[PDB]
Design a protein around this ligand. Sequence first.
Ligand SMILES: *[C@@H]1O[C@H](CO)[C@@H](O[C@H]2O[C@H](CO)[C@@H](O[C@@H]3O[C@H](CO)[C@@H](O)[C@H](O)[C@@H]3O)[C@H](O)[C@H]2NC(C)=O)[C@H](O)[C@H]1NC(C)=O
Ligand SMILES: *[C@@H]1O[C@H](CO)[C@@H](O[C@H]2O[C@H](CO)[C@@H](O[C@@H]3O[C@H](CO)[C@@H](O)[C@H](O)[C@@H]3O)[C@H](O)[C@H]2NC(C)=O)[C@H](O)[C@H]1NC(C)=O
Lengths: 93, 93
Amino acid sequence: LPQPSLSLHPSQGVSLGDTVTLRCHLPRMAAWVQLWLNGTLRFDKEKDKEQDAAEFSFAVTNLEDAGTYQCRYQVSEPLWTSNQSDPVELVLT
Amino acid sequence: LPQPSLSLHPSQGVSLGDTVTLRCHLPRMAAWVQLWLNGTLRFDKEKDKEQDAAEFSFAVTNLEDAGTYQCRYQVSEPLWTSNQSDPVELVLT
Ligand SMILES: *[C@@H]1O[C@H](CO)[C@@H](O[C@H]2O[C@H](CO)[C@@H](O[C@@H]3O[C@H](CO)[C@@H](O)[C@H](O)[C@@H]3O)[C@H](O)[C@H]2NC(C)=O)[C@H](O)[C@H]1NC(C)=O
Ligand SMILES: *[C@@H]1O[C@H](CO)[C@@H](O[C@H]2O[C@H](CO)[C@@H](O[C@@H]3O[C@H](CO)[C@@H](O)[C@H](O)[C@@H]3O)[C@H](O)[C@H]2NC(C)=O)[C@H](O)[C@H]1NC(C)=O
């Protein structure tokens, strides 16, 4: 199970009220993709087999949105999970 | 996707230092099973297709172990998630 990689856009000068996109890149298999913040699961979503990535887009609405983002993915046939992606940091303001 | 159900043993007179088992009952399909505490993911693990349940057994090590436990399960073929189980409350002492 290949380690996913995570990108953040925008990554510089992000402020409250801005919308950010965390794009989790993984293989073209159907999978449940998770976004983790500070070592705790924040969001998950389905990624159809044909997609190259799952994207988590959200508004920055408070100071606790800052921190260390990672992504992980899982399949049930076989019963496998990836390791966490290398981290990407959301720094506010 | 049938809603899972969760049991807790022991459920009465539980104290710090005791070991509890949260047993998540679901169908005989291979699946990733999650244990959630107070609406945030705590643990996950694989459940082999032949198992009737995934069990999360852990020691009660602090007061923050108390609260509302639920379980959820997911498969990637098809890309489906259950709803949360009805809640079971761990009450300490
Ligand atoms: C993920 O970890 C982040 C990095 O530690 C953490 O970042 C921030 O969280 C706290 C809580 O909001 C901020 O501290 C507050 O700052 C305000 C303004 O000064 C104070 O009024 C308040 O009392 C408190 O000190 C930190 O400034 C901030 N740190 C950084 C680098 O942005 C996230 O909260 C955390 N997110 C989670 C766990 O969901
Ligand atoms: C999941 O929700 C639980 C129910 O709200 C929560 O329960 C408990 O959490 C707090 C934090 O430890 C306890 O309050 C503390 O009590 C000690 C002893 O009096 C104080 O010294 C301390 O300052 C603080 O008030 C609550 O007593 C307790 N409530 C119950 C019903 O057990 C869990 O913390 C929470 N678990 C999570 C989010 O991981």
